[PDB]
A and B are shown apart, each in its own frame.
Chain A
Amino acid sequence: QEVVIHKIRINLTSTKVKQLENVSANIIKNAETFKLVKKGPVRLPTKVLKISTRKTPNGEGSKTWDTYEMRIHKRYIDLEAPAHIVKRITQITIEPGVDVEVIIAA
Protein backbone atom coordinates (compact mmCIF):
# COMPACT_ATOMS: atom_id res chain seq x y z
CA GLN A 1 0.00 0.00 0.00
CA GLU A 2 2.56 2.58 1.25
CA VAL A 3 4.68 0.88 3.96
CA VAL A 4 8.19 0.60 2.48
CA ILE A 5 10.88 1.38 5.09
CA HIS A 6 13.34 4.14 4.06
CA LYS A 7 16.35 5.83 5.74
CA ILE A 8 15.27 8.94 7.70
CA ARG A 9 17.60 11.48 9.33
CA ILE A 10 16.04 14.25 11.46
CA ASN A 11 17.99 17.37 12.50
CA LEU A 12 17.17 19.55 15.51
CA THR A 13 18.80 22.96 16.08
CA SER A 14 18.24 25.64 18.76
CA THR A 15 19.68 28.16 21.25
CA LYS A 16 17.41 27.03 24.12
CA VAL A 17 18.63 23.71 25.57
CA LYS A 18 15.59 22.75 27.64
CA GLN A 19 13.21 23.25 24.73
CA LEU A 20 15.41 21.11 22.49
CA GLU A 21 15.51 18.37 25.12
CA ASN A 22 11.72 18.46 25.42
CA VAL A 23 11.40 18.16 21.65
CA SER A 24 13.77 15.19 21.64
CA ALA A 25 11.77 13.52 24.41
CA ASN A 26 8.55 14.05 22.45
CA ILE A 27 10.13 12.52 19.35
CA ILE A 28 11.31 9.50 21.33
CA LYS A 29 7.82 9.05 22.80
CA ASN A 30 6.33 9.16 19.31
CA ALA A 31 8.84 6.57 18.12
CA GLU A 32 7.98 4.32 21.06
CA THR A 33 4.28 4.63 20.28
CA PHE A 34 4.95 3.68 16.66
CA LYS A 35 7.68 1.15 17.80
CA LEU A 36 10.11 1.33 14.84
CA VAL A 37 13.85 0.84 14.11
CA LYS A 38 15.57 3.52 16.17
CA LYS A 39 18.94 5.22 16.54
CA GLY A 40 19.21 7.46 19.64
CA PRO A 41 19.21 11.29 19.88
CA VAL A 42 22.86 11.78 18.85
CA ARG A 43 24.24 15.03 20.26
CA LEU A 44 26.69 17.09 18.20
CA PRO A 45 29.33 19.38 19.84
CA THR A 46 27.61 22.65 20.85
CA LYS A 47 28.68 25.59 18.69
CA VAL A 48 29.67 28.80 20.50
CA LEU A 49 29.48 31.86 18.25
CA LYS A 50 31.91 34.50 19.49
CA ILE A 51 32.04 38.30 19.13
CA SER A 52 34.55 40.80 20.51
CA THR A 53 33.67 44.48 20.79
CA ARG A 54 35.30 47.45 22.51
CA LYS A 55 32.69 48.46 25.14
CA THR A 56 33.22 52.13 24.18
CA PRO A 57 31.37 53.70 21.24
CA ASN A 58 33.91 56.54 20.90
CA GLY A 59 37.28 54.93 21.73
CA GLU A 60 38.39 57.05 24.71
CA GLY A 61 38.84 55.30 28.07
CA SER A 62 40.54 52.19 29.44
CA LYS A 63 40.35 49.62 26.63
CA THR A 64 37.59 47.25 27.81
CA TRP A 65 36.12 44.39 25.79
CA ASP A 66 32.93 42.33 25.47
CA THR A 67 32.47 38.61 24.81
CA TYR A 68 29.00 38.30 23.29
CA GLU A 69 28.54 34.56 22.72
CA MET A 70 25.63 32.61 21.21
CA ARG A 71 25.55 28.84 21.82
CA ILE A 72 24.02 26.53 19.19
CA HIS A 73 22.61 23.11 20.10
CA LYS A 74 22.50 20.69 17.16
CA ARG A 75 21.18 17.14 17.67
CA TYR A 76 20.16 14.43 15.19
CA ILE A 77 17.88 11.37 15.28
CA ASP A 78 17.92 8.37 12.88
CA LEU A 79 14.76 6.42 12.04
CA GLU A 80 13.90 3.54 9.71
CA ALA A 81 10.23 3.97 8.73
CA PRO A 82 7.80 4.78 5.92
CA ALA A 83 7.98 8.53 5.18
CA HIS A 84 4.31 9.21 5.89
CA ILE A 85 4.69 8.01 9.48
CA VAL A 86 7.74 10.25 9.92
CA LYS A 87 5.79 13.22 8.54
CA ARG A 88 2.94 12.50 10.96
CA ILE A 89 5.39 12.35 13.86
CA THR A 90 6.99 15.65 12.86
CA GLN A 91 3.79 17.59 11.91
CA ILE A 92 3.01 17.68 15.64
CA THR A 93 5.58 18.13 18.51
CA ILE A 94 6.80 21.58 17.34
CA GLU A 95 7.96 24.11 19.96
CA PRO A 96 8.83 27.77 19.07
CA GLY A 97 12.60 28.37 19.09
CA VAL A 98 13.54 24.81 18.08
CA ASP A 99 14.16 24.23 14.36
CA VAL A 100 12.76 20.87 13.17
CA GLU A 101 14.50 19.59 10.02
CA VAL A 102 14.03 16.40 7.95
CA ILE A 103 16.51 14.86 5.46
CA ILE A 104 14.18 12.00 4.32
CA ALA A 105 15.15 9.01 2.06
CA ALA A 106 18.58 7.37 1.58
Chain B
Amino acid sequence: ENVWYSHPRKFGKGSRQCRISGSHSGLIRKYGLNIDRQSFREKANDIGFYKYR
Protein backbone atom coordinates (compact mmCIF):
# COMPACT_ATOMS: atom_id res chain seq x y z
CA GLU B 1 0.00 0.00 0.00
CA ASN B 2 3.14 2.22 0.12
CA VAL B 3 3.73 5.06 -2.44
CA TRP B 4 6.12 2.63 -4.14
CA TYR B 5 7.43 -0.85 -3.21
CA SER B 6 9.06 -1.92 -6.51
CA HIS B 7 12.04 -1.32 -8.80
CA PRO B 8 11.93 -2.43 -12.51
CA ARG B 9 12.28 -6.25 -12.47
CA LYS B 10 11.36 -7.28 -16.03
CA PHE B 11 14.70 -8.85 -17.08
CA GLY B 12 18.05 -10.05 -15.69
CA LYS B 13 18.37 -12.49 -12.78
CA GLY B 14 15.65 -10.48 -10.97
CA SER B 15 12.76 -11.44 -13.29
CA ARG B 16 13.48 -15.17 -13.62
CA GLN B 17 12.44 -17.04 -10.49
CA CYS B 18 12.42 -20.85 -10.14
CA ARG B 19 9.28 -23.04 -10.01
CA ILE B 20 10.41 -25.12 -6.99
CA SER B 21 13.00 -23.19 -4.94
CA GLY B 22 12.66 -19.61 -6.19
CA SER B 23 16.43 -19.43 -6.73
CA HIS B 24 17.95 -16.82 -9.04
CA SER B 25 21.07 -19.04 -9.29
CA GLY B 26 21.73 -21.81 -11.87
CA LEU B 27 18.36 -21.56 -13.63
CA ILE B 28 17.57 -23.81 -16.62
CA ARG B 29 15.32 -21.63 -18.81
CA LYS B 30 15.80 -23.88 -21.89
CA TYR B 31 12.52 -25.21 -23.40
CA GLY B 32 10.71 -23.03 -20.82
CA LEU B 33 11.42 -25.24 -17.80
CA ASN B 34 12.40 -22.41 -15.40
CA ILE B 35 13.71 -25.00 -12.93
CA ASP B 36 17.03 -24.47 -11.11
CA ARG B 37 19.68 -27.07 -11.92
CA GLN B 38 19.95 -29.25 -8.81
CA SER B 39 16.17 -29.50 -8.47
CA PHE B 40 15.86 -30.38 -12.16
CA ARG B 41 18.48 -33.10 -11.75
CA GLU B 42 16.61 -34.49 -8.74
CA LYS B 43 13.29 -34.63 -10.68
CA ALA B 44 14.48 -35.19 -14.31
CA ASN B 45 12.73 -38.56 -14.87
CA ASP B 46 9.40 -37.00 -13.82
CA ILE B 47 9.71 -34.42 -16.64
CA GLY B 48 10.67 -37.27 -19.01
CA PHE B 49 14.38 -36.53 -19.48
CA TYR B 50 16.66 -39.58 -19.29
CA LYS B 51 20.38 -40.34 -19.13
CA TYR B 52 21.15 -42.51 -22.18
CA ARG B 53 24.59 -41.26 -23.27
B4 at the interface (CB under 8 A from A): no
Q: Are B51 and A66 in contact (CB under 8 A)?
A: yes
A-B contact count (CB 8 A): 37
B19 to chain A, nearest CB (A): 15
Chain A stretch 65-83: residues in CB contact (< 8 A) with chain B: 66-70
Q: Which residue of B lies closest to A57 (CB)?
A: B38
Interface size class of B (residues with CB under 8 A): 10 to 19
Q: Are B37 and A15 in contact (CB under 8 A)?
A: no
Q: Are B37 and A67 in contact (CB under 8 A)?
A: no
Contacts of A69 in B (CB 8 A): 49-53
Most buried by A among B47, B48, B53: B48
A51 at the interface (CB under 8 A from B): yes
Q: Are B51 and A70 in contact (CB under 8 A)?
A: no
Chain A stretch 43-99: residues in CB contact (< 8 A) with chain B: 49, 51, 53-55, 57, 66-70
Cross-chain contact of B49 among A51, A54, A55, A57 (Cβ < 8 A): A51
Q: Mark B20-42, 1 if CB is under 8 A from A, else 0.
A: 00000000101100000110110
Q: Which residue of A lies closest to B49 (CB)?
A: A68
B28 to chain A, nearest CB (A): 7
Q: Which residue of A lies closest to B40 (CB)?
A: A53
* Interface, chain A (partner B; CB < 8 A): 15, 49, 51, 53-55, 57, 66-70
